[PDB]
Amino acid sequence: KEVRKVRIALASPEKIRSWSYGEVEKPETINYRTLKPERDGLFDERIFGPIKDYECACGKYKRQRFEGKVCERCGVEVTRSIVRRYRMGHIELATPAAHIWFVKDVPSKIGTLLDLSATELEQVLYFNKYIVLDPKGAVLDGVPVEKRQLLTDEEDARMGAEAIQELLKELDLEKLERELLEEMKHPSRARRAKARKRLEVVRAFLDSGNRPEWMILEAVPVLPPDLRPMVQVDGGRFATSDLNDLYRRLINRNNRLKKLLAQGAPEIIIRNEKRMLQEAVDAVIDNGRRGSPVTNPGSERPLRSLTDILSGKQGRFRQNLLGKRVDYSGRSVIVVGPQLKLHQCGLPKRMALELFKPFLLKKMEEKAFAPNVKAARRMLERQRDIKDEVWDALEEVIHGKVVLLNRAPTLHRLGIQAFQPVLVEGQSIQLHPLVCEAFNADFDGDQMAVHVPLSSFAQAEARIQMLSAHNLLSPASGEPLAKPSRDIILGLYYITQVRKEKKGAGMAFATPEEALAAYERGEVALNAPIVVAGRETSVGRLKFVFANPDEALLAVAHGLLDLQDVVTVRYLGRRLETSPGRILFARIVGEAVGDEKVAQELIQMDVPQEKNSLKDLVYQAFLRLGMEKTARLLDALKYYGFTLSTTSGITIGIDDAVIPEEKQRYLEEADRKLRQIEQAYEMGFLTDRERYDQVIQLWTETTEKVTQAVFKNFEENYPFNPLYVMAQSGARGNPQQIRQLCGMRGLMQKPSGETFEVPVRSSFREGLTVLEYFISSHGARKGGADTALRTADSGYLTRKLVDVAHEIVVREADCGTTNYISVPLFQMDEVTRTLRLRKRSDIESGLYGRVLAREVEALGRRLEEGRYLSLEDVHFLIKAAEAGEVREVPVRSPLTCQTRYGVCQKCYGYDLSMARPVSIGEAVGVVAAESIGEPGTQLTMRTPRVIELFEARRPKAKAVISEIDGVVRIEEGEDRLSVFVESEGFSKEYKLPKDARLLVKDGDYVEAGQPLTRGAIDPHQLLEAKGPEAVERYLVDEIQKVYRAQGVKLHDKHIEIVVRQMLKYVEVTDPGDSRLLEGQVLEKWDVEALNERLIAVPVAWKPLLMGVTKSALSTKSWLSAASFQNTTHVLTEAAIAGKKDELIGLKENVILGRLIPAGTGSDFVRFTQVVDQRTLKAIEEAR
Amino acid sequence: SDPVRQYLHEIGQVPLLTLEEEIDLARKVEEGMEAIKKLSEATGLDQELIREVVRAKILGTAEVDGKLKSLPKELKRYLHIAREGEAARQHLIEANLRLVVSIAKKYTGRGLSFLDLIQEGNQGLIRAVEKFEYKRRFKFSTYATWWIRQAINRAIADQARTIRIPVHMVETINKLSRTARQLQQELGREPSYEEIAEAMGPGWDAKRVEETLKIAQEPVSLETPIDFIPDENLPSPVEAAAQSLLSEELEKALSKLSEREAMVLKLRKGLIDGREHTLEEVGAYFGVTRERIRQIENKALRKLKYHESRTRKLRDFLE
Amino acid sequence: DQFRVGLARLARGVRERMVMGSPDTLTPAKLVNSRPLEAALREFFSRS
DNA sequence: AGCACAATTTAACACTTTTGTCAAGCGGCC
DNA sequence: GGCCGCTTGACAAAAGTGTTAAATTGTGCTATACT
Ligand SMILES: [Mg+2]
Ligand SMILES: [Zn+2]
Ligand SMILES: [Zn+2]
């Protein structure tokens, strides 16, 4: 059949003897004096004891066997375990045991009535009195009370852990009651918490079998694995494995007990010799509480027992999910060079012989070359250096067949992609430059995992979506990526920075005077006005829109037009002033795509420069192109983008950054103000502290002035000469990076926290005073330990993001939801009570192609409801926002949809990539992680706030807020500067300490009460005194502030689709027929219990609030969860009860082996597409 | 902090014995199996059935009494005598315990933890206290003090991080160990393997002496320190892919063969399934006898080899 | 320090050697073995 | 630190026999 | 008459049963010292 759902939970002790049957016992000897393998005990091959001469009877047929001595046609030689499972039995029959029972009071305390001491009896050190015969001391009992001697005071009676098995049926018959008389404990508060947990644990045993077999009475390990043979190589030898020795402390103990018990063995001797047996159980399960090192009493390495290794932390769960081991790929260095811009790649011309060897062998079989496939495996091994004909047949195989190039580490969706292998020379694997901006890494010897897809159904599934010429142009986040990265920008920026070299201001009677005279000396081709224009009258480039401006590029080639934009009149489409330099740009993009008609109305002219706008040109072009042509651009801007800079050259000489000749005296006035604040001390004025910050602000301002003077000196005169600005404006330079070199930047702060006294005498050209560098280093330390510390905690937080949003996939078609969200067009500023334009940078990416909740009327045409408001509509609303017609643009966010198992159709406006609506199959659940999967490295963990709200952890100072909206009420005293809020009702007492105690008045819903300036009280209180109204929005607004501080491109619903997961769980109150009054049912699934039953029972609920890590421990499935930091409690709660895993889930399929429910394997794309015309015609009658 | 303390508090909570209550209660054992032996040969219970089964009843703290009540005219005292002597398996064996523990603190290292050593140790009392010669006027005391360590040495050799080390290996290992440490303390450098032969005697050269330190004593690797060591070569993927391939190649290389030759090789060189039948069994079913069916075997070595020197295929041997 | 830590066992080993036996083999060369203060002192340079 | 006795058990190796393979002889066919 | 093929006889090489020699356990038990 076909794999589908999955089942688990506990298994009765009788079921344990089912899978294992028998074959066990005997010591755990891993060898003998001779015959290292067999041992007839530990890992003995089932029915293999030297020469059993049997067992082969169970097998029907297939082959012969029974060879008397040595071995027959058994598994030992072949099929031995075959990596398959092989349970033993470990026999066992002692008093009792324990399956760890986790550390969340499971299988005990909850189903019983004892804590912090439930182990005292489970470890054979107490007495769980489970009998009634009327005591004496203080009446009888029914639980633990006989702590030694007590149980003998009367001399049933159970002092061992064996009682755990006795409370099986005793709790089973009372189970029905444990669900009735237990729930009988109505409110009363306090204890109404235990009754909830006790009912959840007993709710499992309430149905679907599952008995309290927690009291293990016979374990069953594994033998096939652990057994590593001799491993020489290099300089070493010997070998072995675990799981065996650490297991020897279980069977042997069970046997020795069978030898002691059988003979004369008094109580005391058995009680301790038994507790060690269960200890061995937990020992084989998980080593904790005390541990069990090797070579006792000496301490060394902790024995590996599932914990952290296998079924636990990174060891056999983190490595098997994704970080497996590809059996078809390789690694190499990185290189760059004009290949063809996308559509191609590098990849060696030697190793490729192995990656594409398979099909390559079959090709030669028919191409005369190799006589057979086998022979083709012995012509390329001894490095005979073929380099003959084979390199040709290899091309046929590498024709239209793409390859997947990966980058480590990985970040966002832009971390893989695919190209077409174009074997070059050597071994270095090169790629296109632009692609680097997606991996974030400088070429310095880095590698790239080169994966290769085999199946042809994987090739088309790749080159059609993973091709760099598709899923790279317009990435997620918000802004484009394929845009011309660094370098390229400077290749077109070096020709549009004006040529005004200052010539003066003469005048001619229509070019008959200062035309020839000035051509001799003074006044060249800069200013000077005549008739109307200026010096533009000199080289009139005629031509036309026939074959580009001839006279233009023609004169430039010769010793005429200096190019580099020297101001010249062309003819193009009209008498302009654009220089032949810009003409080139428009000519490059012209022939590239098709006719300048598009680039003409797109490319600007008023403010050319080619600054940080190259991302808008290509972006705006997509609307009139669409990959096919778009790709051509990034290719045209390539060739010229580098050649122009090559056949020109621009070096960074030590003088290239001319020192501000008008700076020296500036420091004089700044230093002349030093004594000013210094002599104030000798006169006893202004506290030493006031003096401190007084001088700080001084240099904090002058620095900006000096930077301004420099940036200015580098603006007017010295245009193209200064490269430090050519990249600072828009290419590959930082503005604050300039004030460092020619500047003087020295406002460094002490290592702890206190800006030093005197700054730093930067001016690199002049070596520091040997003290300046040591002083500036104190601050240049946090700028490296923080970025590197982005793998300590922050790096282990992104996982939490990918776990939460997982089963979120865009499917179905038109769900139909009323309630909608109204995105704010204007935000407030804590500083001053006044809304701002939100800087536009937030509104744009916040409404980029959405779903207008309702008709939008705003001067002119209306924006129909459900209309995909592209970038155009956005600008139309922003520019019309200043007018005063719109304040809250209506829209539909993923936060409004009755579907927790699936995303939503057409609701997630635009698939932010192909410039169109999302496609059914786009796992936004993973894309949402790709959005946040980038800023991580660009943060400051050394304080952390983004995760604070996620886990809903109460922020610093709690930031107390008004839970209710009363009135003013502002009373002050001595130390009780607390503020209250009430109105004709009850008054709460907010012990407001001493800090942000503002006035304010007229009550307040929540706001902040004044003290909570930022990071309002944990969402717990919000939703508690508000609901899923502010919770779902407060995050999308606050959380982004941490991103807006660094100007992030991502935004939109990428972060608005992950919130619905943390707010899709509800509680229970007076349920209908459904058990558990407490409960913790999910959203949609709960709506079902109130949808079908609505045609009858009231099933009210309350919008609960869970963190980000909590949305994993308790989910609709189990395969997920764990990981984080609790791969122990998960499998517990997950077990016991039925808790049947769902089906629709990326992981569920990847792990189990099923196909992806998303991608091309979605339930919306599994039909037929084969019909060569006549096929449909034939079947038409064949039916 | 180990669980040994819990037992250390239960073992050191009950007092040992005075001095005279050691023999007065011991004699109960002697007359015990004796009074029990009365019914033994009386019905034929080997005197071991009346003891093992009765002792199980002596510990009511957790049947045969039937016929033990019909006591004839000559039986009525033996009853009380059997139960009176039943108290022999009562108090005794509750003291030695404490007197024990303070001994396992010696073998704290060799093998098995302190807690484990307790087992094999105290267990040595179960059989020691039993075989006590109440005759001699020495009084039981520091005797079982030995029946424990001897059980420990007989245990540390039985149980260890090895495989199977009898009384002929542990005693030799420690002997080669003390010697290696004996010559070391009387040389200045670590003695080789052969240089230790003279230290022993006859039979001990350098090979066998190396075979002793070859097996183990406690090594066998630290199991899996720091998925420790990879290494693997059993269910080789390519070997399996080439397994069927090399097989298919033969299925194809046999297409130029005749039944009265191919099948002959099939049954002869055990291929059909696994039966390595010989020309004798291949001649009975193939009409003709030996020779010519053997002249076809050679004909196969040649007629087939003649199809190899011209057709590359000698690359299937290295597999 | 490591040397000391290693020499610590030697002292502990001598004690055990003084608790058992008397005339058989008890000489300042037999009670001291070049294994504890050695192997434990060598594993420091090879692994630490 | 451990030796023996006994007892008993485990392990392996060697024999005489049998089986298989090769060469020679006889018969049949051309 | 000759050549080829088939069958039988002889020789050589490798197994089932027998035979004996080497190792473990128990127990015995030893044994010695201390209380
Ligand atoms: Mg690097
Ligand atoms: Zn067999
Ligand atoms: Zn929807």
d(CA A494, CA A723): 10
Could you tell me which residues are beta bridge partners of residue A889? A823
* Reported structure resolution in angstroms: 6.5
| CB-based burial label for A452 (10 Å; 0-12, 13-18, 19+) | buried
Q: Is A436 labelled a binding residue?
A: no
Dihedral-angle region of residue A822 (phi above 0 means left; psi in -120 to 50 means alpha; beta otherwise): beta
Say yes or no: B219 contacts chain C, CB-CB below 8 A. Answer: no
- Strands, DSSP E only, in A548-634? none
Torsion of CA A211, A214, A218, A221, to 10 degrees: 110
H helix runs in A902-945, sequence order: 924-932
In order, the DSSP letters of A757-825 are: SS-----TTS---SSHHHHHTTTTTHHHHTTTTTTTSGGGTHHHHHHHS-S----SS-------EEEES
Please answer yes or no on whether C29 and B106 come within 8 Å at the CB atom. no
Q: By CA distance, what is C30's nearest residue in B?
A: B182
DSSP H or E stretch at residue A525: none
Task: Tell which residue, C46, C48, C44, C47, has the closest CA to residue C2.
Answer: C44
Alpha carbons A531 and A1141: distance in angstroms, whole number: 84
Q: Any CB–CB contact under 8 A between C28 and chain B?
A: no
In angstroms, what is the span from residue A31 Cα to ligand 2's centroid? 20
The 3-state DSSP class for residue A956 equals coil
Asked if B184 lies within 8 A of C34 by C-beta distance, the reply is: yes
Q: Is A345 annotated as a binding residue?
A: no
Query: Which pair of tokens denotes residue A897?
Result: 């949809």
Contact A240 B223 (CB under 8 A): yes
CB < 8 Å from C in window 106-135 of B: 106
In this structure, the number of other CB atoms found within 10 A of the CB of residue A1003 comes to: 16
Task: Please tell me the distance between residue C34's alpha carbon and the centre of ligand 2 in angstroms.
Answer: 50
Is C32 part of the contact surface with chain B (CB cutoff 8 Å)? yes
CA distance A1168 to C35: 76
Q: Are residues A986 and A1002 in contact, defined by beta-carbon separation less than 8 angstroms?
A: no
Nucleotide lying nearest to B164, CA to C1' measure? E24
Residue B124: exposed, middle, or buried by beta-carbon count in 10 A (0-12, 13-18, 19+)? buried
Token code pair at residue A452: 């290769």
For the domain made up of A651-791, give the CATH fold.
Topoisomerase I; Chain A, domain 4 (1.10.132)
In the block, residue with structure tokens 């079998």: A209
Separation of alpha carbons A933 and A69, rounded Å = 62
- The Å distance, Cα A67 to ligand 2 centre, comes to 4
Last residue before each gap in chain B (C to N over 2.5 A): 62, 226
Give me the residue label for tokens 């502002």. Answer: A970
Q: Please, are residues A1118 and A1141 in contact by the beta-carbon 8 Å criterion?
A: yes
CA atoms of A478 and A837, how far apart (whole Å)? 19
- E strands in A60-173: none
SS3 B246: helix
Report residue A508 as tokens: 């001619």
Give the H or E element holding residue A904.
Answer: none
Cα separation, C33 vs C37, whole angstroms:
8
B182 CB within 8 Å of a chain C CB: yes
Cα angle vertex B86, ends B82, B91, to 5°?
160
- The contacts of residue B34 (CB under 8 Å, 6+ apart) are B85
Does residue C16 belong to the interface with chain B, where contact is any CB pair within 8 Å? yes
Residues lying close to strand E (Cβ under 7 A), chosen from 162-181 of chain B, are 166-168
Provide the CA C25 to C1' E9 distance, Å, integer: 78
Shortest distance between the Cα of A447 and any Cα of chain B, in A, equals 24
Residues of A in contact with B229 (CB under 8 A): 228, 231, 239
What CATH number belongs to A326-470?
A: 2.40.40.20
User: For residue B114, what are the contacts with CB-CB under 8 A and spacing of at least 6?
Assistant: A296, A297, B2, B4, B104, B105, B108
User: Which residues of chain A form CATH 1.10.132.30?
Assistant: 651-791
Do the Cβ atoms of A975 and A824 come closer than 8 Å? Answer: no
Beta carbons of C32 and B186 less than 8 Å apart: no
Bridge partners, residue A1120, by sequence: none
Boundaries of CATH 2.40.40.20 in chain A? 326-470
**A155–B61: do the CB atoms touch at under 8 Å?**
yes
Centre of ligand 3 from the C-alpha of residue A902, in Å: 9
Technique used to solve these coordinates: X-ray
Q: Give the other-Cβ count within 10 Å of B238's Cβ.
A: 10
Nearest nt to the CA of B19 via C1' is: E35
Phi (first) and psi of residue A703, to 5 degrees: -60, -45
d(CA A1083, CA A1066): 6
Is B123 touching A (CB cutoff 8 A)?
yes
Contact B142, B158 (CB under 8 A): no
Residue A29: list chain B partners with CB under 8 A: 163-164
Q: Enumerate the residues of chain A whose CB falls inside 8 A of the CB of residue B274.
A: 63-64, 73
Which residues 139-198 of B interface with strand D at a CB distance below 7 A? 171, 174-175
Give the three-state DSSP class for A181: coil
Closest CA to A48 of A79, A17, A18: A79
Distance A24 CA to E14 C1' (A): 38
Cα dihedral A759/A762/A768/A769 (nearest 10) = -30
Q: Using the CB atom, is residue A296 less than 7 Å from strand D?
A: no
H runs (alpha helix) in A223-344: 245-262, 267-285, 318-321
CATH code 1.10.274.100 region(s) in chain A: 471-650
As a dihedral over the C-alpha atoms of residue B28, residue B31, residue B34, residue B36, rounded to 10 degrees, the angle is: -40
DSSP-H helix ranges across A1017-1082: 1019-1024, 1031-1044, 1059-1062
Question: By 3-state DSSP, what share of chain C in percent is helix, strand and coil, each rounded to 5?
Answer: 60, 0, 40
Nucleotides of D under 7 A from a protein CB: 1-2, 11-12, 19-22
CATH node for A471-650? 1.10.274.100
Residues A500 and A452 sit within 8 Å (Cβ to Cβ): no
A442 marked among binding-site residues: yes
Q: Does the bond joining A409 to the residue before it have cis omega, within 30 degrees of 0?
A: yes
Chain B residues with CB inside 8 Å of C19's CB?
106
Q: A742 a known binding residue?
A: no
Tell me if chain B has a CB within 8 Å of the CB of C30: yes
Residue with tokens 């980000």: A1108
Q: Are A1087 and A1053 in contact, with CB atoms under 8 Å apart?
A: no
Ligand in nearest proximity to the CA of A899: 3
Distance in Å, CA A34 to ligand 2 centroid = 19
B98 touches chain A (CB under 8 A): no
Asked if A429 and A347 count as a contact pair (C-beta separation under 8 A), the reply is yes
How much distance in Å is there from the Cα of A56 to the middle of ligand 2?
8
What residues contact residue A1134 under an 8 Å CB cut-off, 6+ apart?
A: A8, A1118, A1121
- With a 7 Å cutoff on the CB, does B276 touch strand D? no
The answer to whether A904 is a known ligand-binding residue is yes
